[PDB]
């Protein structure tokens, strides 16, 4: 290809693809265990944040990846491991560890490209260095409610719901 | 200048234009701690205090300096003292003590000015006489919601919400 | 915090807000200057310039340092020195000075940011970079205009009042 | 409470109120007794002026109470003496005498708040400084009316119509 | 008058319309208290309790005497009873007893129009006799609220404030 | 009269309209002088200033004093003193002697009705203590203009045209 | 001046700027006595003809006048000759000779304008031949009013309200 992409730096790029994927399909199981607990407001926030991975994360990397002929790659690495939540306390700490782990896996991808002088991917990565924060605070926020000292199902239930 | 403002009283003004600078700066500290604190909220409202500070007081008292050809000087006085808050009762504390200087010096101005028969002063001063107690107001509601008995985190935040 | 910033880093954020407030607070002080020399349109754009750092500048940064949980602390920074002015040559003088210092300072943390591979704070400081040369163009510019030979207080007025 | 008002004051703003709710309770009176001795234009013109002491200027008194944390005590005040009506003259006597008192009452207030250095509680008072020489008008109009010379009651009824 | 309605059935409304007044005058008290309580929705819910008793009880009242021309006399039956309240438990109480005796006097006034073969004075008492239920259970809902085991004042000002 | 206002106060109300009144005509005599002088836009300037004083100052003086049922006499006070003028720079000198006056006339007005508790002609004049600075404003900005060194009639003319 | 207008004629120009000023100045003060007499639509009509002359005469004197270049010069002529009046009779008096004067002044600069070839006068006199029959007119309407038999005094206002 006239792009000539190194293929360290676009195997970083799909990995990122399925480090989104992997808080994706997690978020889509914690939606149905939190459904299950009886918050149906928190697993529609999960619904909607695995939603938003698929349609702003995922797809602009796919995006990207097309503009310079590039190949994703869909692995393992995409496929959450799950423990059992008995908690909806247990459900938000898993939550807070992927996104945290999403938000690395930006900065690495971004620290990378730059090393490599990969000017295009750095630019790329600008807008997932910026929201990774906006998610990051999103479930960070639904874990502080949860948490909170002496709140009850229908307080994590109403203020959840106003993020929907 | 033709309007030969007499200089105590303009200082007056200028001293105000620093009261209402300090609040505003307390406030957009108190925004970044209540957030730290979990408080996303409270936060944004101590961001709209600070920010009708400077939209709606400060613009009004250097478009008065400005008509009457005085100068405003910006001063010390401008910079809040800070002191650590571990809990969003201590944040509110520190609010209601601020806000509530802001009106005793609108009063002192008023009650200056008009003693000095400097009635445009008085004049200009009358809004700020009836808007401080709106802004007084406003922050010892939140101060009452947070030190409230038995109230939890979200409870704070749910109603708290419904000021912005 | 799950962010886990760098406090030295955002300490300089910190500081980079009160720098822009040093800014606002010398502009409202200028515009003062300005109009009680006889430029009533000068002023008006000292205005301008001010009430531009708090609603784009500041707002900017207090909002970023709360999506990292991190601290805003208001200090002595945030207060212009004063010296006295005669003519509007000088107070143009000391406002390009001013909007230099805040160019520099963008250039400082933008700098230091990416050389910690905070990315995320380079990453907000690029709004930064861009504006701050659009607004030392600005001051440049109606410097250029006072500074010009053998101009008239007339011709300021009137080629400012097309900056409004 | 924040507001630290004095007692003294409040309790004057508080029969101030008592005072305005007698002129409308002796408004309402009066517009059956018109109303019974023909005169509908003239009993709707006293609805109106009785309504407008509600929703105008007892509405007014006690939001402001509120805004300062004080009390409004409803008393005896507001019970007007009732005397025997024979003829729309002396309706109108009565109008006239009780609107008067409005008046004074306000003066009362306005200038003891002054004195007192109570300049929030002055200036909720100018409001009705204003508007109490208009209520003092509008009656003090149609007493001109019933009182003239050589007019019947058509006459007074087509004219007061027109105030409606 | 061409009407000839019994004094004793005018009486009886002219005493009921002082009922409606006396619970006006206790709803705008009891906002004024709960306010200071630190009630800011309670005390709202009040003033428009207050409001309606004027602009749609107090009003039909008085137009419906006008239409009969008969007079409407206001004495002390108007002034309520006040005693101290501490807390907003207290001030339901004593909401929830004064709109009992509106209900009551309602009746009272239907029973004995009826009897009295007063079919005019008992088809306007007809909206009465709908419309306390309405303010009955307004009261008696909020009442429910502020007596409700294990609630806090965040939670009575949340549901209260659905009530505006 | 009801309103039983003093007169020796209603006489300072009557003169002050006559101090606007030469005011206005004093500055249609400008702006015939100004017009002769070769400057169109400055003439427009005393024509509006004039008219202003008609529509807005002297309107609201004779509405207030109908209001308290009290006598407007126009007098000697209203023709102004008429002296040659040779040069632009002439002519403003006048303008600003004269507005000068009238906002010094404000203040005398303001301050003695005070004094003697006349706190509607005080409320009343609460309008002109703003407004005298605008006009004062506004006048001493062309004084500005047609005093400063190096300017020509063109540069006058485009600027003034500016203030229409 | 390049107009060359022959200075008596300009000086009468501007002395009828004086009668049109003196019947406003009459009127204006006629309005207040109207008002004081119990005749508010009177004091109404008195204020719009003294209004009138300020909008549509005085200022297309001064117009014409600066289109020639030629100066207005205000002086004792505008100042009225007051009596005291006891009646509404005797106002309309005063008014009916005031707008006599008025007219005859403008038959008095048409003829000399005409007499002195003066056509450029003599065509903006045609304006005032017109509207001095109209301003006349209304004043006659009024004074039939107050003059005829047996009139009282809320005749008089309902006839005279139809001419606001
Ligand atoms: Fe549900
Ligand atoms: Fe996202
Ligand atoms: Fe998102
Ligand atoms: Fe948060
Ligand atoms: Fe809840
Ligand atoms: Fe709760
Ligand atoms: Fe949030
Ligand atoms: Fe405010
Ligand atoms: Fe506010
Ligand atoms: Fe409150
Ligand atoms: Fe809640
Ligand atoms: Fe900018
Ligand atoms: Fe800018
Ligand atoms: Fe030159
Ligand atoms: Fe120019
Ligand atoms: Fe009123
Ligand atoms: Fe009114
Ligand atoms: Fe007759
Ligand atoms: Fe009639
Ligand atoms: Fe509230
Ligand atoms: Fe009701
Ligand atoms: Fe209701
Ligand atoms: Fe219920
Ligand atoms: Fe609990
Ligand atoms: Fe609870
Ligand atoms: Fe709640
Ligand atoms: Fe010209
Ligand atoms: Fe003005
Ligand atoms: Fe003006
Ligand atoms: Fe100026
Ligand atoms: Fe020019
Ligand atoms: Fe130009
Ligand atoms: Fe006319
Ligand atoms: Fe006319
Ligand atoms: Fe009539
Ligand atoms: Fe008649």
């Given at each position: 290809?006239?792009?000539?992409?190194?293929?360290?730096?676009?195997?970083?790029?799909?990995?990122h693809?399925?480090?989104?994927?992997?808080?994706?399909?997690?978020?889509?199981?914690?939606?149905?265990?939190?459904?299950?607990?009886?918050?149906?407001?928190?697993?529609?926030?999960?619904?909607?944040?695995?939603?938003?991975?698929?349609?702003?994360?995922?797809?602009?990397?796919?995006?990207?990846?097309?503009?310079?002929?590039?190949?994703?790659?869909?692995?393992?690495?995409?496929?959450?491991?799950?423990?059992?939540?008995?908690?909806?306390?247990?459900?938000?700490?898993?939550?807070?560890?992927?996104?945290?782990?999403?938000?690395?896996?930006?900065?690495?991808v971004?620290?990378?490209?730059?090393?490599?002088?990969?000017?295009?991917?750095?630019?790329?990565?600008?807008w997932?260095?910026?929201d990774?924060?906006?998610?990051?605070?999103?479930?960070?926020?639904?874990?502080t409610?949860?948490?909170?000292?002496?709140?009850?199902?229908?307080?994590?239930?109403?203020?959840?719901?106003?993020?929907?």
């Amino acid at each position: 290809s006239v792009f000539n992409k190194d293929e360290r730096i676009m195997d970083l790029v799909s990995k990122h693809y399925n480090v989104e994927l992997c808080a994706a399909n997690l978020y889509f199981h914690l939606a149905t265990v939190s459904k299950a607990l009886g918050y149906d407001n928190v697993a529609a926030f999960f619904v909607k944040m695995g939603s938003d991975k698929q349609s702003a994360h995922m797809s602009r990397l796919v995006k990207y990846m097309m503009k310079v002929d590039s190949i994703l790659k869909i692995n393992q690495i995409s496929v959450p491991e799950l423990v059992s939540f008995e908690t909806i306390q247990e459900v938000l700490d898993a939550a807070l560890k992927m996104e945290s782990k999403v938000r690395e896996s930006v900065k690495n991808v971004t620290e990378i490209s730059l090393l490599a002088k990969d000017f295009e991917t750095f630019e790329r990565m600008q807008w997932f260095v910026k929201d990774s924060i906006e998610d990051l605070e999103e479930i960070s926020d639904v874990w502080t409610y949860v948490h909170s000292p002496n709140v009850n199902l229908i307080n994590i239930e109403n203020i959840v719901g106003k993020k929907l």
